[PDB]
Amino acid sequence: LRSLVASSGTLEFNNESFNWTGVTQNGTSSACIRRSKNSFFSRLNWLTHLNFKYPALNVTMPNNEQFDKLYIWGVHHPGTDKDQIFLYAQASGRITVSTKRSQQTVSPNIGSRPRVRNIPSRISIYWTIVKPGDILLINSTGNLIAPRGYFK
């Protein structure tokens, strides 16, 4: 990913509107401080439960731009089971981001890891390239760190 971005030579990001109905958007952390207030990665959306319910998501994002789109997303591995319920209101469900060409299934692993900046949890980052013809398909039942758009 580091060399994929470097060789590209641009950080040009185009914001995109994804249908996130049934879930709370813009989840923030005390680890990520932006202008003295709790925040998160500017290019990533932390999806939380809505009124103690996380519907099985099936969000689509097609490419009609005649150029490849680079998507960055993650999977939140909560330290404790209590967190899992605090954020997602239910047990983990394998996050699956696919296209006409590829598919990536990642299972959230609940478990405490050595504390980093007092955080026993982690976010594993993944990427998907959507070709001009193709469509980006995200399925999640919790623990997904959704994109906010694409990169050139």
Ligand X SMILES: *[C@@H]1O[C@H](CO)[C@@H](O[C@@H]2O[C@H](CO)[C@@H](O)[C@H](O)[C@H]2NC(C)=O)[C@H](O)[C@H]1NC(C)=O
Ligand Y SMILES: *[C@@H]1O[C@H](CO)[C@@H](O[C@@H]2O[C@H](CO)[C@@H](O[C@@H]3O[C@H](CO)[C@@H](O)[C@H](O)[C@@H]3O)[C@H](O)[C@H]2NC(C)=O)[C@H](O)[C@H]1NC(C)=O
Bridge partners of 124, per DSSP, are 75
Q: Is 14 in the site for ligand NAG (CB under 6 A)?
A: no
Least separation in angstroms between residue 60's CB and its own copies is 8
Site string for ligand X, 56-95 (x = CB under 6 A): x-x----------------------------------xx-
* Residue 100 interaction partner, one of ligand NAG, ligand X, its own copies, none, beta carbon < 5-8 Å per kind: its own copies
Q: Is the Cβ–Cβ distance between 100 and 84 less than 8 Å?
A: no
Q: Is the Cβ–Cβ distance between 47 and 89 less than 8 Å?
A: no
The sign one gets for the Cα dihedral 74, 60, 42, 130 is positive
Q: Is 58 in the site for its own copies (CB under 8 A)?
A: yes
Residue 8 or residue 60: which is nearer to ligand Y going by CB? 60
Q: Is 112 in the site for ligand Y (CB under 6 A)?
A: yes
The residue count of the chain comes to 152
Spatial distance between the Cα atoms of 96 and 98, rounded to a whole number of angstroms: 6
Q: Is 21 in the site for ligand NAG (CB under 6 A)?
A: yes
